Design an enzyme around this catalytic site. Structure first.
Site, PDB file in Angstrom:
ATOM      1  N   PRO A   1       0.802  -1.014  -0.038  1.00 43.85           N
ATOM      2  CA  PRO A   1      -0.093   0.180   0.070  1.00 43.85           C
ATOM      3  C   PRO A   1       0.963   1.167  -0.047  1.00 43.85           C
ATOM      4  O   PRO A   1       2.105   1.105   0.084  1.00 43.85           O
ATOM      5  CB  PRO A   1      -0.774  -0.061   1.247  1.00 43.85           C
ATOM      6  CG  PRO A   1      -1.000  -1.532   1.360  1.00 43.85           C
ATOM      7  CD  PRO A   1       0.461  -2.000   1.217  1.00 43.85           C
ATOM      8  N   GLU A   2       0.397   2.345  -0.356  1.00 45.38           N
ATOM      9  CA  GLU A   2       0.757   3.731  -0.246  1.00 45.38           C
ATOM     10  C   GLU A   2       0.179   4.534   0.805  1.00 45.38           C
ATOM     11  O   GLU A   2      -0.755   4.350   1.403  1.00 45.38           O
ATOM     12  CB  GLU A   2       0.941   4.145  -1.880  1.00 45.38           C
ATOM     13  CG  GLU A   2       1.522   3.101  -2.792  1.00 45.38           C
ATOM     14  CD  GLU A   2       1.743   3.510  -4.165  1.00 45.38           C
ATOM     15  OE1 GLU A   2       2.176   4.873  -4.268  1.00 45.38           O
ATOM     16  OE2 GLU A   2       1.851   3.067  -4.827  1.00 45.38           O
ATOM     17  N   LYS A  53       3.831   4.477   5.307  1.00 44.45           N
ATOM     18  CA  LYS A  53       3.099   3.151   5.030  1.00 44.45           C
ATOM     19  C   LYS A  53       2.766   2.391   6.198  1.00 44.45           C
ATOM     20  O   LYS A  53       2.636   1.125   6.101  1.00 44.45           O
ATOM     21  CB  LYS A  53       3.998   2.426   3.959  1.00 44.45           C
ATOM     22  CG  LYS A  53       4.003   3.067   2.732  1.00 44.45           C
ATOM     23  CD  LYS A  53       4.942   2.133   1.775  1.00 44.45           C
ATOM     24  CE  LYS A  53       5.445   2.864   0.586  1.00 44.45           C
ATOM     25  NZ  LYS A  53       6.146   2.119  -0.316  1.00 44.45           N
ATOM     26  N   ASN A 175       4.915   2.530  -5.676  1.00 44.32           N
ATOM     27  CA  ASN A 175       5.124   2.401  -7.180  1.00 44.32           C
ATOM     28  C   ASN A 175       4.266   3.233  -7.926  1.00 44.32           C
ATOM     29  O   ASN A 175       4.389   3.722  -8.806  1.00 44.32           O
ATOM     30  CB  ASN A 175       4.954   0.858  -7.315  1.00 44.32           C
ATOM     31  CG  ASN A 175       5.642   0.408  -8.671  1.00 44.32           C
ATOM     32  OD1 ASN A 175       6.690   1.051  -9.076  1.00 44.32           O
ATOM     33  ND2 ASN A 175       4.847  -0.371  -9.417  1.00 44.32           N
TER      34      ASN A 175
END
Length: 284
Positions: A1-2, A53, A175
């Protein structure tokens, strides 16, 4: 996750648990390899905060609660499929690995950390991961100062698309964010990191900034504003039933990641970086 997700998840927990009173022990599934949570209290409140995060839950016993219990913090890392869900006691998700149950007053509910793939992790204590830098969302100024102050670090000899994933300096960037950020400035993903930031190495007044910075944000400013856009778009949909609607909005928000026509390459870590145009001098 971000970053955006962790922030939104924390917001969900706080709002959903604000008036709830939990009681008893914290239950961990037998299969989970994460640590058992030594805790027991007849009446406690759950609150949360996020940083990069990571999400930190704090269990706070209410006055009079028994047996005697000190507040306990737990830090979570979601992984590919981790999440927090608040569900009816008789409808526990099949993959709920950590559970907190509401006390007798009112409908019996359970706050659960669900994670089918089991890539998620949690540790006892409220200490953030060692080495992770300031959150790009909640600690922008500290985040920016830390990058500029440590540019000499070998971390910035790597291409910019790789340095953006280094959580020691870009805590919260993942990403899809590195792709969207670089695309906004059309910066080649494989340009030397330090080269893109060097120029940034009570000075300018608001009027001066409005005239030369407002319509020309730098890479570091976007590491904060881009994820902030995702936060605003997400509103209060986390933990609710608006999953379909929320993903459709997210899909429409993307300008580069996984978009048609966009180029793609694999960095030294094997992660795919999406971009448009020149890949850069350090391209593999």
């Amino acid at each position: 996750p971000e970053g955006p997700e962790l922030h939104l998840a924390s917001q969900f927990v706080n709002e959903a648990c604000r008036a709830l009173v939990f009681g008893g022990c914290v239950e961990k599934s037998s299969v989970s390899r994460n640590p058992e949570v030594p805790f027991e209290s007849s009446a406690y409140r759950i609150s949360a905060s996020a940083r990069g995060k990571e999400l930190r839950l704090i269990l706070s016993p209410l006055p009079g609660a028994q047996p005697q219990q000190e507040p306990l913090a737990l830090v979570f890392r979601f992984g590919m499929s981790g999440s927090f869900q608040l569900v009816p006691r008789e409808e526990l998700p099949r993959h709920a690995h950590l559970r907190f149950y509401t006390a007798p007053p009112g409908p019996r509910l359970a706050l659960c950390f669900v994670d089918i793939r089991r890539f998620g992790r949690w540790d006892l204590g409220g200490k953030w991961q060692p080495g992770r830098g300031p959150c790009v969302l909640q600690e922008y100024q500290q985040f920016r100062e830390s990058v500029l102050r440590n540019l000499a670090d070998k971390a910035f000899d790597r291409p910019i698309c790789e340095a953006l994933l280094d959580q020691r300096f870009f805590n919260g960037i993942g990403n899809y964010l590195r792709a969207e950020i670089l695309y906004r400035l059309k910066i080649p993903p494989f340009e030397k990191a330090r080269s893109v930031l060097e120029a940034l190495q009570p000075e300018l007044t608001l009027s001066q900034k409005i005239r030369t910075k407002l319509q020309n944000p730098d890479l570091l400013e976007l590491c904060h504003s881009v994820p902030k856009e995702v936060v605003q778009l997400g509103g209060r949909g986390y933990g609710s039933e608006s999953g379909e609607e929320d993903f459709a909005a997210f899909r429409a928000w993307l300008r580069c990641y996984g978009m048609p026509g966009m180029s793609s390459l694999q960095d030294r870590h094997g992660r795919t970086i999406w971009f448009q145009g020149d890949p850069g001098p350090l391209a593999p």
